[PDB]
Amino acid sequence: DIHTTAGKLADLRRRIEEATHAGSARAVEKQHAKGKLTARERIDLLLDEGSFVELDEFARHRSTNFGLDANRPYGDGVVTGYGTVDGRPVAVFSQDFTVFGGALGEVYGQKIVKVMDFALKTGCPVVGINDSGGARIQEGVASLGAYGEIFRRNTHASGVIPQISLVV
Amino acid sequence: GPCAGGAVYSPAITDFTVMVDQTSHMFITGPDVIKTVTGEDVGFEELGGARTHNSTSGVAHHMAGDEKDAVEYVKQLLSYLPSNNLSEPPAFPEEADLAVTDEDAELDTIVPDSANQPYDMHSVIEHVLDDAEFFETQPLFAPNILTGFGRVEGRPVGIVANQPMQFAGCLDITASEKAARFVRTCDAFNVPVLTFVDVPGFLPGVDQEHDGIIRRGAKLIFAYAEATVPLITVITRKAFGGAYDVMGSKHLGADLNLAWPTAQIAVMGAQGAVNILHRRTIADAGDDAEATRARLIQEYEDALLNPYTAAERGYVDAVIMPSDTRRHIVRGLRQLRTKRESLPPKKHGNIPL
Amino acid sequence: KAARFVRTCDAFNVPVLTFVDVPGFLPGVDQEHDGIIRRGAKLIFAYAEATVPLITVITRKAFGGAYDVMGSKHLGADLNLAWPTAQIAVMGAQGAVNILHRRTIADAGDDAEATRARLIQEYEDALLNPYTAAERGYVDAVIMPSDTRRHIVRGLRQLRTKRESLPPKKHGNIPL
Amino acid sequence: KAARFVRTCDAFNVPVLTFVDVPGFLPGVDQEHDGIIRRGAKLIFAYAEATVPLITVITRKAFGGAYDVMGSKHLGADLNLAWPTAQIAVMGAQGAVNILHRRTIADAGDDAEATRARLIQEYEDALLNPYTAAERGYVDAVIMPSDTRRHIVRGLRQLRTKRESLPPKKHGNIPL
Ligand SMILES: CCC(=O)SCCNC(=O)CCNC(=O)[C@@H](O)C(C)(C)COP(=O)(O)OP(=O)(O)OC[C@H]1O[C@@H](n2cnc3c(N)ncnc32)[C@H](O)[C@@H]1OP(=O)(O)O
Ligand SMILES: O=C(O)CCCC[C@@H]1SC[C@@H]2NC(=O)N[C@@H]21
Ligand SMILES: O=C(O)CCCC[C@@H]1SC[C@@H]2NC(=O)N[C@@H]21
Ligand SMILES: O=C(O)CCCC[C@@H]1SC[C@@H]2NC(=O)N[C@@H]21
């Protein structure tokens, strides 16, 4: 159904499946062929088993430039959340190359800002896993705004909470 | 016992007031004076008895059947609070088992199919707290909202939740003031606050406006926005208009905002929305005036009466299975316990009175 | 009304001058049921919390808890003045005598009144003034009404450099 | 050069005015190998760290990361103005079209150019301006060049009382 409670739960499960598999099969195929792991496989390696708690899993971009609104994948190209590393709190984001070539967008960037604000607020390390072709050109200057907000956070958090950049 | 005259103002300032049924009374003016001045003939019990102050005036926080029970209640109250604002509340740490239990599963079916059929929010609260133990405060006042204490992994937490069984969970003056003071109490004493949302909006009524709902309802938003302690909000069902903002929304500073699949986060109801958005579309074709709007209403609700638009914008950090609520709150508080935030320097705020 | 204004002034470093003439609180079941206890307490909280200069002038009546509420020295008022017409007492003469002389008046059913009437008269001529409070220092001085302006001006001059602070806290828990 | 000057001004409470006209970074293998990544980042650090008043004026070009670096609002700039001649875009029209219309241009080997040439022309006439940024509020206003002095003077008057601070720390860890 859908108008029933059980139907809404089943609906959620479906979206979860779609979100956890945002990138296409061929995209993932291309990634693995380059000797690279997917955004989620990397997070599973970093965090302690079962500690991962995803944030903005169902986030989607709000752009209509150059037919971008034709495809609005859940997560918008980056996996984020928090968990524990060796039992200690850690905030993390993992850019998804299989989605828009991992090109940084507005929502995409806002997700990274949320994880950084969480880390600063709670005082825990930030592990950034980078794998992006660059700025999502369709969004124009909006992507530059995202970068800037991130740079600002990077600077304010400098010497406050550990920041490690994993470039894969 | 008795507490008359200006004396009543001392307990009023304290954080919690516990009375004894048919044994304690509070009042600024006695029956004799009001009698000769207003002509009103009232007895002590009705004027300022335990029940009156626990369900009518909103000044008392609990009415015990006897003194022994009253003392037991205060001891309970103290067990959830620190000795002073410089320490976290008294804790007895114990790692919880985050595996999905048969009890957790019950949450997936607690919300009925009919958006009208109510459910007891008490059940929701108990399912996430240690030993399903919920210590409620002001139970007889503004039953449309619940406030109280509990523990998560042995750590004291505060609770604020709309009660669908009363006024459909709607907010109003009394509920706003009740919850506002409680939240500020928890914040001042470093007690995290867990809020469960299911509010269709505010209780309509000329009396609500004339009695100052604008300045009194604002007390709750001020409370949440002011709070620096951990804040986790779970929207189980309804969350419309300003009510949504008021109930510990992320916009106010909430750290973690979760929503169930049954959540309905929107500006207003489908009818009120369509009647405005399609007022001109529906105006046309007088033939089949209805069914044409009933369709628009159906489209609007099936399209917006959910938590996915909010999730898209990150207003809610996640849409979760009801059964995973305990897991989220437990892991959320573990990280949030080191939350360090502060407001701009000031002597104090100027909260609406 | 007054509670929020006082807090507003305090938050923005504005000195507060208070003029007192209050017989007490407005009797009524509605007042009680509507929560006068927690709502009226907001005014005492505002005054006790205020760290800005506080000067209070009692022009006439000041009975019971109302006296305490209206920026009394006990709440932290820096300068409290009272006019000769001020009546600072725990309660009205009639209400006080019916208690203090409940037994002395009970005697002789005949001449019931006139006895307490005289007692009421004696009580007001003896206690319904600001001198007992002045003896205790509750008011810093009993002044001629015409000297109020002089007292306020000189008072504010000295009090402008007032420095006070409450115990450290995230914020208070004022009644709501 | 600019990074250390900005920090110097900030440490000594000197407001910083920035005028932008940058097409990007100077291409070159040497720039990369000599560490432009960590050395160029010093400028964004300086700006993001600065708590003194910051007013930025974009007179013309402002593309890619260079835009972010040059005292952008995203870094904390208090007032960002742009002239009508400003070109605030993610990248040059040519580079942008070769991506956005890579497929649309691939069609018809004949008429290869002129198609993208027109596209480049359309892109610059549509996006190579400061209005998209203005719609988003990235720039507080698009002003007439002649009104720059007026904006700077009035801006500094209000910003002179700016009070801001970074999270507590012994010091930052600026790239070296
Ligand atoms: C800010 C404070 C305010 O709002 S105004 C004060 C409001 N309080 C009251 O009206 C009552 C206070 N205390 C009470 O005990 C009341 O219940 C009253 C009505 C005064 C008790 O009166 P009642 O017991 O009938 O006669 P009595 O007290 O009239 O006189 C006989 C013995 O009682 C004693 N008593 C004990 N408390 C008080 C009191 N507060 N005021 C006056 N007398 C009191 C009297 O001293 C007297 O005993 P004794 O002969 O002195 O050994
Ligand atoms: O409570 C209801 O269901 C009736 C609607 C009236 C409540 C008003 S609508 C504007 C304001 N925002 C809200 O969420 N509730 C009130
Ligand atoms: O206001 C009046 O004149 C009537 C008297 C009743 C007011 C009560 S007496 C106890 C309490 N203390 C006060 O100062 N006023 C109230
Ligand atoms: O400077 C130029 O005009 C040549 C273009 C190359 C500069 C690169 S494009 C990515 C990066 N972002 C910028 O703003 N400039 C550099």
XYZ file of C-alpha atoms in Angstrom, chain C:
176
model
C 4.164 43.954 32.226
C 6.656 45.444 34.703
C 8.740 42.283 34.991
C 9.724 42.253 31.326
C 10.317 46.001 31.233
C 12.679 45.751 34.229
C 14.626 42.910 32.593
C 14.775 44.884 29.349
C 16.286 47.912 31.124
C 18.698 45.697 33.023
C 19.920 43.875 29.921
C 20.665 47.221 28.323
C 22.208 48.919 31.335
C 19.306 51.277 31.956
C 18.849 52.426 35.590
C 15.390 51.747 37.021
C 13.428 54.170 39.217
C 10.414 52.724 41.047
C 7.563 54.635 42.738
C 5.563 52.593 45.222
C 1.952 52.915 46.307
C 0.447 49.444 46.432
C -2.123 48.119 48.939
C -1.460 44.556 47.810
C -2.640 42.175 45.118
C -6.009 42.249 43.359
C -8.200 39.631 45.105
C -10.000 37.120 42.894
C -10.373 33.392 42.232
C -9.375 34.016 38.613
C -6.071 35.554 39.718
C -5.253 32.378 41.666
C -6.434 29.936 39.030
C -4.641 31.833 36.263
C -1.366 31.394 38.144
C -0.678 34.668 39.971
C 1.792 32.726 42.123
C 4.176 31.932 39.241
C 3.332 34.980 37.150
C 3.547 37.512 39.964
C 6.886 36.024 41.009
C 8.289 37.199 37.682
C 8.515 40.763 39.047
C 10.540 39.858 42.112
C 12.845 37.782 39.888
C 13.399 40.772 37.583
C 14.320 43.071 40.474
C 16.527 40.561 42.314
C 18.321 39.790 39.052
C 18.892 43.415 38.038
C 22.424 44.725 38.447
C 21.755 48.229 37.076
C 21.273 51.104 39.544
C 17.980 50.747 41.439
C 16.319 53.631 43.271
C 12.937 53.132 44.922
C 10.561 55.749 46.265
C 7.597 54.749 48.430
C 5.082 57.591 48.179
C 2.346 55.878 50.165
C 1.063 52.304 50.554
C 3.416 49.319 50.717
C 1.810 46.280 52.372
C 2.704 42.591 52.574
C 4.498 40.806 49.754
C 3.633 43.711 47.460
C 6.158 45.796 49.417
C 8.835 43.142 48.786
C 7.967 42.941 45.093
C 8.148 46.664 44.332
C 11.929 46.981 44.143
C 12.490 46.623 47.886
C 15.948 46.867 49.388
C 15.720 43.162 50.263
C 15.738 42.366 46.538
C 18.854 44.441 45.925
C 17.548 48.002 45.546
C 20.489 50.374 46.087
C 18.580 53.379 47.394
C 15.139 53.233 48.992
C 13.424 56.456 49.959
C 10.063 56.921 51.649
C 7.739 59.910 52.014
C 6.147 60.811 55.393
C 2.896 59.614 53.849
C 4.328 56.140 53.290
C 2.629 53.205 55.011
C 5.016 50.259 55.207
C 3.429 47.408 57.143
C 2.980 43.633 56.998
C -0.717 44.156 56.313
C -3.670 46.483 56.742
C -4.502 47.662 60.257
C -7.898 45.934 60.228
C -6.484 42.591 59.161
C -3.612 42.885 61.624
C -5.736 43.736 64.676
C -8.262 40.962 64.018
C -5.309 38.652 64.608
C -3.143 40.341 67.237
C -6.172 41.244 69.355
C -8.431 38.341 68.392
C -8.755 37.335 72.049
C -8.764 40.832 73.556
C -11.637 41.664 71.209
C -13.486 38.395 71.798
C -14.097 39.554 75.358
C -17.367 41.411 75.893
C -19.703 40.552 73.029
C -21.159 43.955 73.779
C -18.803 46.742 72.716
C -17.519 44.241 70.151
C -16.538 46.942 67.686
C -15.337 50.362 68.854
C -12.871 48.219 70.794
C -11.232 46.822 67.682
C -12.161 50.018 65.852
C -10.063 51.872 68.413
C -7.419 49.147 68.122
C -7.399 49.559 64.343
C -7.028 53.299 64.827
C -4.183 52.812 67.311
C -2.429 50.315 65.049
C -2.473 52.603 62.026
C -1.308 55.630 64.010
C 1.522 53.521 65.396
C 2.604 51.217 62.551
C 1.115 52.572 59.326
C 4.142 54.746 58.578
C 7.681 54.283 57.226
C 9.515 54.739 60.528
C 9.757 51.120 61.708
C 11.232 50.266 58.297
C 13.500 53.317 58.633
C 14.707 52.176 62.061
C 15.696 48.831 60.501
C 17.311 50.561 57.553
C 14.901 48.952 55.081
C 14.542 52.452 53.682
C 17.700 54.567 53.583
C 15.773 57.723 54.447
C 12.368 59.291 55.016
C 12.296 62.387 52.836
C 10.151 65.403 52.136
C 8.255 64.761 48.895
C 9.791 67.905 47.381
C 13.291 66.505 47.919
C 12.679 63.441 45.746
C 14.292 64.926 42.629
C 17.378 65.948 44.612
C 17.717 62.454 46.042
C 17.289 60.751 42.682
C 19.834 63.005 40.964
C 22.508 62.648 43.661
C 21.737 58.954 44.034
C 22.187 58.172 40.345
C 25.445 60.150 40.282
C 27.025 57.767 42.821
C 25.234 54.615 41.645
C 26.220 55.050 37.994
C 29.481 53.239 38.782
C 27.651 50.303 40.390
C 29.306 46.953 39.738
C 27.469 43.757 40.700
C 27.027 40.256 39.288
C 25.059 37.098 40.037
C 26.530 33.606 40.493
C 27.866 32.071 37.256
C 25.210 30.199 35.262
C 24.051 29.527 31.691
C 20.931 31.472 32.600
C 18.280 31.675 35.284
C 15.063 29.665 35.499
C 12.541 32.466 35.889
C 8.936 31.302 36.420
C 6.987 30.941 33.163
